[PDB]
Amino acid sequence: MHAVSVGKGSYATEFPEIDFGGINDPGFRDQQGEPPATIYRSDRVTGPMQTNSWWGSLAVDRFSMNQYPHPFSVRHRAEGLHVFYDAPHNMVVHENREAGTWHIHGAIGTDFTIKHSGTANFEQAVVDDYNDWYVRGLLENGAHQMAITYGVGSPYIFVEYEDGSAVLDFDIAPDVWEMNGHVIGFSTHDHKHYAAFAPPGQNWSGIGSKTLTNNADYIAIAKLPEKDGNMLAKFEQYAYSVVRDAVADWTYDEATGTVTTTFEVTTEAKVQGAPDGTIFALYPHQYRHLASSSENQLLQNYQYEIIRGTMIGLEGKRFTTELTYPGVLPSLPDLGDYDRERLIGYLHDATSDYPTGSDTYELGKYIGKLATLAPIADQMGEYELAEQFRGELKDILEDWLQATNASGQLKGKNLFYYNENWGTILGYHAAHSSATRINDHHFHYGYFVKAAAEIARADQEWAKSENWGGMIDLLIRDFMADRDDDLFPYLRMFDPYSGNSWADGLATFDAGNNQQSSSEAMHAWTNVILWAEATGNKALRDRAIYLYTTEMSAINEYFFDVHQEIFPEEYGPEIVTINWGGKMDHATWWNSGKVEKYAINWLPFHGGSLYLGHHPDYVDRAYEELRRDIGSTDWNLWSNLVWMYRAFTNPDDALQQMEASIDDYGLFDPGNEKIIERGSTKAQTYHWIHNLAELGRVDPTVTANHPIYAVFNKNGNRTYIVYNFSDSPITVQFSDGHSIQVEPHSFNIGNG
Ligand SMILES: OC[C@H]1O[C@@H](O[C@@H]2[C@@H](O)[C@H](O[C@@H]3[C@@H](O)[C@H](O[C@@H]4[C@@H](O)[C@H](O[C@@H]5[C@@H](O)[C@H](O[C@@H]6[C@@H](O)[C@H](O)O[C@H](CO)[C@H]6O)O[C@H](CO)[C@H]5O)O[C@H](CO)[C@H]4O)O[C@H](CO)[C@H]3O)O[C@H](CO)[C@H]2O)[C@H](O)[C@@H](O)[C@@H]1O
Ligand SMILES: OC[C@H]1O[C@@H](O[C@@H]2[C@@H](O)[C@H](O[C@@H]3[C@@H](O)[C@H](O[C@@H]4[C@@H](O)[C@H](O[C@@H]5[C@@H](O)[C@H](O)O[C@H](CO)[C@H]5O)O[C@H](CO)[C@H]4O)O[C@H](CO)[C@H]3O)O[C@H](CO)[C@H]2O)[C@H](O)[C@@H](O)[C@@H]1O
């Protein structure tokens, strides 16, 4: 009646009576709630609702907030759809020295408004359909309707009218520089180039005035790369092919490591003979990895400048990208030159640690910490301590994964609840608007999956579906479901076209959606790979490999700008902390200092963190910039994270800094994260830095034909690491010709 059994656990189906623990703080109490009752979607959109999208404000606001279907920005209003393009004169880079922040952003203006001839008083805008990256927004006023189809990577906006015709309204009269009757090429007063397309015979009127009109029930708008009539002619070819379906289909080739993704649209013809295809605008993370077979479709000189650099290309029905999955590990192995008794001391010191809150995030950080300690305890021969840590993980998870208490009533805290209205699993206690805004389910639940994966590595029985594995699989479905999931939308967190996760469930900001900790996203994907490998779930594993590998490609472009092509030259920092649809910030969601505005995109450190070391020149450049700003190696906070990061390129330096300060303070103290960040430990730090000192640099030039591995290179000497989750021994072949044998449930080397 009020909960559903899943193996030995359960989730609530009615909102629980929350146990506030006597806490009266209104912020805390307000967090223990639900997402909005009203969803602005039509009756054509049923089942679990998509969240965490670039377009989500359309579903949550009566109209919308400002959105970034690059190359455009748009927003829905009662009067119609405002369209804007950030030109170079709209873009700024600002620094607040006192705050230690930087901001790259544009403007919230209007180049023109797409209007309906019958009304400028629409009652609302709803989601009428969506696919993997386009949305169809429907402005409604009784008989009057205007359906707008648009998307990230679409230089078209398609507009379909019921009970009226087209109007384009400008504050200052545009320059119509090409008048083909039914097709016009035009520029705003400030020289931004667009085009509009109607069916043949439906001619544009009002040329030279502030208002352009057309009798058609269909128009398209395009952003033109240049004031160029040859480009206009090309845009005409696909202006009548309205995108209805759009899918990002992927494969993982386990033998080579190649993750192949094909982006395919299906269109509906608005004039006789319109082709089945479109003009895509590709982002850097896409076109830098374009498959050979798609190269012939590139429209070479078709460039658009946006927050994320230069978009380009590309015509037709589909295109394909190719990426390389680099492996992950369950932990670093025992290969460091540490004082083993010193490490054992740190492992025991860690029993003093405790969670600094009762919510899913703080509890998550704590269980992540225990899961990281357990394999290190095993390696040092502290086997009962390792079992103690895994026992504590079991006690915590077996609590959280049951929604009912001993009497069969719903609990008031430490439980999961299925919100049916949206279709999402919410955990209470909640924080960071995980429940009220559907935020951060990857960030939080990734830690629960880490804990489960460490249990499963030692105890396959616990992890069975009929035991505790069903509830873990339910949490994973919430944040990364496959298609046709009866409870959850497809790949909730991930935007397959933008290439990254979006953290905010609702997206009701004028900068679109955002993501701060890309490393906490990569942590979630890693842990699902590990969990799925441990539990024999190939389909789930491969989906997490696709996510890990794609997200990595976006991180290296938009957070790190490893290729030094995207961030403006005048932007001082060597990282963007928070990526939005519409802007980039060197800033945090909480009040922080200098280190945190870098390290929130490094933490936590774990067996999937080696992606951070693929670009040693970047690692050096970012570290040196942070050091310059600090003015020394007296890190303001989270010193251990900076040492661990530094170890990717200079472990001698990291070791020197660590030796100097790691023992400055003693046991766990929540009031002091100067030296050890609260999700980290001395044991983890010491183990990490000494391992990288012995191993050398991450070597992404070598792949393997199994997924759980890493390759390091120290002055030309390679070390090959594999962990085998199987009951049977395996042979792993590496792309440089090397091969190794691995026994069941072990590393090939450094089991300790
Ligand atoms: O060391 C002591 C110090 O530690 C800090 O903990 C760090 C922790 O905060 C950090 O968490 C990451 C987190 O940022 C991220 O979650 C965010 C989520 O926080 C964000 O919420 C925003 C609200 O912040 C915002 O607040 C509004 C406010 O800005 C405005 O001025 O006033 C309004 C008054 O009501 C207020 O509402 O509101 C918007 C909605 O409008 C919310 O969305 O939302 C984003 C998504 O949009 C979400 O991603 O993700 C993770 C947690 O889920 C974390 O990565 O993590 C660090 C490392 O673990 C911690 O060190 C404490 O916060 C400090 O208090 C301590 O002193
Ligand atoms: O200095 C001591 C105190 O500092 C603290 O932390 C600071 C921290 O709160 C701050 O967070 C930044 C966010 O405020 C910022 O949020 C922006 C939104 O406010 C804005 O909302 C608009 C809304 O105002 C308008 O009415 O409606 C719009 C929709 O129509 C809506 O968009 O949206 C922006 C995006 O569109 C959004 O950016 O977001 C920043 C990241 O981009 C955050 O960094 O950041 C400071 C720097 O890190 C922190 O110092 C503590 O919270 C206090 O307790 C301390 O006392």
Side-chain angles (χ1 to χ4, degrees), residues 65 101 508-511 578 580 583 585 587-591:
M65 274 69 176
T101 59
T508 43
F509 303 102
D510 283 332
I578 304 176
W580 295 83
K583 67 187 175 109
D585 301 304
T588 46
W589 278 111
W590 77 99
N591 188 46

Side-chain angles (χ1 to χ4, degrees), residues 407-701:
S407 76
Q409 297 280 64
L410 291 182
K411 292 148 62 172
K413 59 176 185 177
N414 308 352
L415 75 163
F416 291 104
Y417 158 67
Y418 183 73
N419 171 276
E420 189 188 334
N421 182 41
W422 290 86
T424 180
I425 289 288
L426 309 177
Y428 301 101
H429 290 145
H432 300 279
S433 306
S434 55
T436 54
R437 292 183 73 82
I438 324 179
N439 289 357
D440 303 337
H441 289 189
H442 59 349
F443 296 160
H444 297 204
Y445 307 167
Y447 288 99
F448 285 72
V449 182
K450 177 49 171 294
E454 177 51 26
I455 292 162
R457 192 178 68 75
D459 183 352
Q460 295 183 61
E461 190 69 20
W462 187 97
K464 286 165 141 264
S465 295
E466 67 266 28
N467 294 325
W468 299 100
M471 283 292 295
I472 296 299
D473 289 326
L474 188 77
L475 293 187
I476 294 166
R477 289 166 56 193
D478 175 77
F479 72 86
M480 59 167 282
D482 203 350
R483 299 189 191 279
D484 311 311
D485 186 302
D486 296 321
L487 294 182
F488 307 112
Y490 176 62
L491 285 188
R492 181 191 304 284
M493 304 311 298
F494 202 65
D495 180 337
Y497 199 95
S498 305
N500 60 280
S501 292
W502 295 116
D504 199 89
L506 308 185
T508 43
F509 303 102
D510 283 332
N513 216 316
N514 75 96
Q515 176 139 286
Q516 179 180 242
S517 186
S518 66
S519 46
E520 282 180 329
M522 292 290 284
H523 180 241
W525 313 139
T526 300
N527 297 332
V528 178
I529 295 168
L530 296 168
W531 169 256
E533 188 64 30
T535 59
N537 189 341
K538 192 189 173 168
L540 180 57
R541 186 199 65 190
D542 292 353
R543 191 160 77 259
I545 287 169
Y546 152 71
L547 292 167
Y548 181 99
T549 306
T550 307
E551 188 108 50
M552 184 175 70
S553 78
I555 289 170
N556 283 330
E557 300 291 357
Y558 317 123
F559 286 82
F560 299 163
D561 187 22
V562 301
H563 311 291
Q564 302 189 259
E565 291 170 352
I566 294 171
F567 302 160
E569 193 175 10
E570 69 268 28
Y571 180 73
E574 287 289 342
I575 200 164
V576 161
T577 316
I578 304 176
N579 265 278
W580 295 83
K583 67 187 175 109
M584 289 172 167
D585 301 304
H586 192 78
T588 46
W589 278 111
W590 77 99
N591 188 46
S592 74
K594 291 171 181 180
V595 164
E596 299 98 302
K597 294 170 183 67
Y598 282 80
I600 191 55
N601 276 282
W602 309 336
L603 71 86
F605 281 79
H606 58 103
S609 291
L610 301 177
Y611 79 94
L612 292 169
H614 286 200
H615 295 282
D617 291 351
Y618 171 64
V619 172
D620 281 333
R621 183 169 74 249
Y623 172 83
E624 286 169 5
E625 169 54 25
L626 176 57
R627 189 182 61 191
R628 184 203 63 76
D629 193 27
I630 291 281
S632 69
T633 62
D634 181 28
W635 312 115
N636 66 285
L637 214 72
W638 304 351
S639 302
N640 77 301
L641 298 183
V642 185
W643 309 333
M644 292 172 84
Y645 189 74
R646 181 53 160 173
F648 280 122
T649 63
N650 192 338
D652 286 349
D653 187 18
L655 282 171
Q656 168 219 48
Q657 294 179 44
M658 181 194 70
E659 301 301 350
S661 299
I662 194 176
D663 301 316
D664 277 0
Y665 310 100
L667 299 176
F668 185 66
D669 177 7
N672 179 22
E673 299 189 46
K674 168 75 163 175
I675 301 299
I676 306 295
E677 181 272 335
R678 71 173 179 275
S680 307
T681 55
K682 289 179 192 187
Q684 176 191 34
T685 305
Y686 189 66
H687 183 258
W688 176 274
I689 296 169
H690 275 291
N691 266 300
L692 267 53
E694 284 290 340
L695 289 164
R697 304 280 181 90
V698 177
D699 193 343
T701 73

